[model samples]
Target: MKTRADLFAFFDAHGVDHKTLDHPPVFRVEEGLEIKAAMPGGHTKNLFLKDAKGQLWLISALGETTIDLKKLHHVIGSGRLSFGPQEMMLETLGVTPGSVTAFGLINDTEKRVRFVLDKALADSDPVNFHPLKNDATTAVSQAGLRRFLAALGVEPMIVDFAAMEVV
Candidate 1:
């Protein structure tokens, strides 16, 4: 398993530039607002979910955005999604509940989780996520993030959820 330092080194080796901010551990969207206010990029809330039949998904979206679970499956071309089991999350992403992050995909050697990004966030200049831990947030350019994912051998699907009803 890779640590945060390993992740940073991976980004460096791949020429993916980013900035990281360290703060108190934050487990909820509301708890992150103050820290996010100091960061330049759009903050995100990441979801680790599993659908019926056990398909896993990792979704990252702007903090304030609401994802419509009912319509999201159709939009993403998957079955209905629900929060993934904690053990599955730890096994797949190598992160616990509050630490869920797209960066955790680095540890997903089998590529078990489908990675998705909100178009709103994908379109933003820089996107922020946990660095496999919730005590720090890493900001990377949208393109840099794509580069990171590509290097991990996972191509993320950017979805437009603006038109979907909020849940």
Candidate 2:
């Protein structure tokens, strides 16, 4: 029961224009770089994180963007941050290891995860993300992403990653 098909239909119903790129199953960002380069947009990576107080955060940023976990808490104004467990990833985000995507926040109906968006990525002309699954990539224009998240009632916690000295 892959969710990609359902995601496609949902995108249509909500008027979210998207392009689908099918490729070999990718388990890591580097493994899919070749295929990702073929797409015409800003690529993104989602990190499932937890803090000292056990708060859940999902930071989505440009595919190659880097953030130092050691000091992430200062930027987000939270406790220290660390990689969330695989079990928590599946249970909370409803996604497996490499399948992580901010879209997973859709499954967090209880509104438990802090969905953070890298301002740089959001400013791109278009953006790329896994559509609830990772066998392929889904591309959406900047407006399209706004529409998609708007329809889902999801607001991203925008962060200026580039502006941070240690980000």
- Top lDDT hit: 1
lDDT of 2 by residue, 1-167 (tens): 23677777878888878897878777666976687678877888899998999998998999767777787788888789988998888877789988898777667767778878888898887788888778888888899888877877888778877675322
lDDT value, candidate 1, whole model: 0.86
* Model 1, residue pairs in steric clash: none
> Residue by residue across 1-167, what tens digits does model 1's lDDT show?
68999999999988778898899997567966788787887888899989876799999999778888767888887888899999989998989988989899988999899998888888887888889998888889988888898899897788878875222
- TM-scores vs. true structure, each candidate: 0.92, 0.87
The list of candidate 1 runs beyond 4 A from truth reads: 27-33, 165-167
- Error in Å for residue 146 of model 1: 1.2
List the global CA lDDT of all models: 0.86, 0.80
